[PDB]
């Protein structure tokens, strides 16, 4: 190593290992953090029992001390149009974008992990509810079938004439 003159060959080598515990092994800084109560991108969140909207995005806020979610109300429920105090979050229309706190934050549920159950029955997958007829309320419904739009399609301004904008419409 220093004191042997010339001892610049190590007595064979092939064999080697890595990492001591944990499966975590790259850059001890993010890519895969996980945690216990994080939520995940695209995914319906109750808040307070009224407002639910989805996780759009995720990291540090700027005027909280801590990490909060920023959820997007499908509702006009919100405040900011995803910029606060000049950052940018997440690009929606106004009166939408909230931000609150992931523990404060709520999840509801969503279609998806179905066999992921970790229950055994019989039966691969079980799906055997109570066949009722009041579930939470009428208005409450399931994906079936809904009233969609309809009309006639031409495409042929003939009165517009709105190629290229410089101002802006809001009002009107």
């Not at 080697?16 to 499966?23: L, Q, Y």
Request: with cysteine; glycine share 12%; aromatic share 4%.
């Amino acid at each position: 190593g220093s004191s042997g003159s010339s001892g610049a060959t190590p007595p064979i080598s092939n064999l080697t290992k890595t990492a001591s515990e944990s499966i975590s092994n790259l850059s001890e800084a993010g890519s895969i953090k996980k945690g216990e109560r994080e939520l995940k991108i695209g995914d319906r969140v109750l808040v307070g029992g009224t407002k639910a909207g989805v996780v759009r995005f995720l990291g540090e806020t700027d005027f909280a001390k801590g990490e909060w979610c920023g959820v997007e109300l499908d509702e006009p429920l919100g405040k900011n149009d995803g910029a606060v105090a000049g950052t940018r979050y997440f690009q929606c229309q106004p009166k939408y974008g909230l931000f609150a706190p992931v523990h404060k934050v709520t999840k509801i549920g969503f279609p998806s992990t179905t066999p992921a159950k970790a229950k055994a029955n019989a039966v691969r997958r079980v799906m055997a509810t109570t066949s009722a007829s009041l579930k939470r309320s009428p208005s409450a419904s399931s994906l079936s079938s809904m009233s969609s739009v309809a009309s006639s399609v031409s495409s042929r301004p003939s009165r517009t004439g709105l190629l290229t904008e410089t101002s802006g419409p809001s009002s009107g």
